[PDB]
């Protein structure tokens, strides 16, 4: 689609905050509708994108780390999960699926995903909230920021999606570039291009 549609629709949603002048932590969303994609047969898609714009920021972080993670995690307000706490929350998966419902996404240590698929790996891989693996930078600052906003474009059996991108206070050509990243990775993720999407919506939480 041309970019001027994005420009006028997004400036109109900034001065169409006048609809409610909302009470909440304001953030907007994308919505997807597909043309003729078969949801049932093969090559169903699940593509995560490294978006470098972080449109969530009211975002919840709790991780699983090695050692050298203790002082830096308790310094910069990151929950260092030890292996004793891994076994503690493994003792009753009801409480960590509360914790999976408490916070948004997890982060994974280097080696302890043999300790995870003991019984808690199959226990809480049934939420879609699998932790993200570290790298050997061993520096979690901006690595958790490049773990967040890795957006899951997902094909489930219904022909509808919606992508949480956009909050009302961020910079504006960067918003239309954010949504441009969203739509071009969506269309290039699909097995067929722009004919395969019926109607892309950008309207807000209200």
């Amino acid at each position: 689609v041309s970019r001027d549609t994005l420009y006028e629709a997004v400036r109109e949603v900034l001065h169409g905050n006048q609809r409610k002048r909302r009470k909440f932590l304001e953030t907007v969303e994308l919505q997807i509708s597909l043309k003729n994609y078969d949801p049932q047969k093969d090559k169903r898609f699940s593509g995560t994108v490294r978006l470098k714009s972080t449109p969530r920021p009211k975002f919840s972080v709790c991780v699983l780390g090695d050692q050298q993670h203790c002082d830096e995690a308790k310094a910069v307000d990151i929950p260092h999960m030890d292996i004793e706490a891994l076994k503690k929350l493994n003792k009753n998966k009801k409480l960590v699926k509360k914790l999976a419902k408490k916070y948004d996404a997890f982060l994974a240590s280097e080696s302890l995903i043999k300790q995870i698929p003991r019984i808690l790996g199959p226990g809480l891989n049934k939420a879609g909230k699998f932790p993200s693996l570290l790298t050997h930078n061993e520096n979690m600052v901006a690595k958790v920021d490049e773990v967040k906003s890795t957006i899951k474009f997902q094909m489930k059996k219904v022909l509808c999606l919606a992508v949480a991108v956009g909050h009302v206070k961020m910079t504006d050509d960067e918003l239309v570039y954010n949504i441009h990243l969203a739509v071009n990775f969506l269309v290039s993720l699909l097995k067929k291009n722009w004919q395969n999407v019926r109607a892309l919506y950008i309207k807000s939480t209200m």
């Binding site: 549609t5 043309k35 003729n36 004919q195 019926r198």
Partner: protein
């Protein structure tokens, strides 16, 4: 012929709309180009009915 193709694109039958334009124009390249400009015309009509 392009009105009838816009009816097929409004009902979103892209394959039979492409086969229709491919018969009643010529080459498959001209078929694809005219199908996509009719899709742009029909999208502009949807936005005109929107706001």
């Amino acid at each position: 012929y392009e009105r009838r193709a816009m009816e097929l694109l409004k009902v979103s039958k892209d394959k039979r709309a492409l086969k229709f334009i491919k018969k009643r124009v010529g080459t498959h390249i001209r078929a694809k180009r005219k199908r996509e400009e009719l899709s742009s015309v029909l999208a502009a009509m949807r936005k005109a009915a929107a706001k």
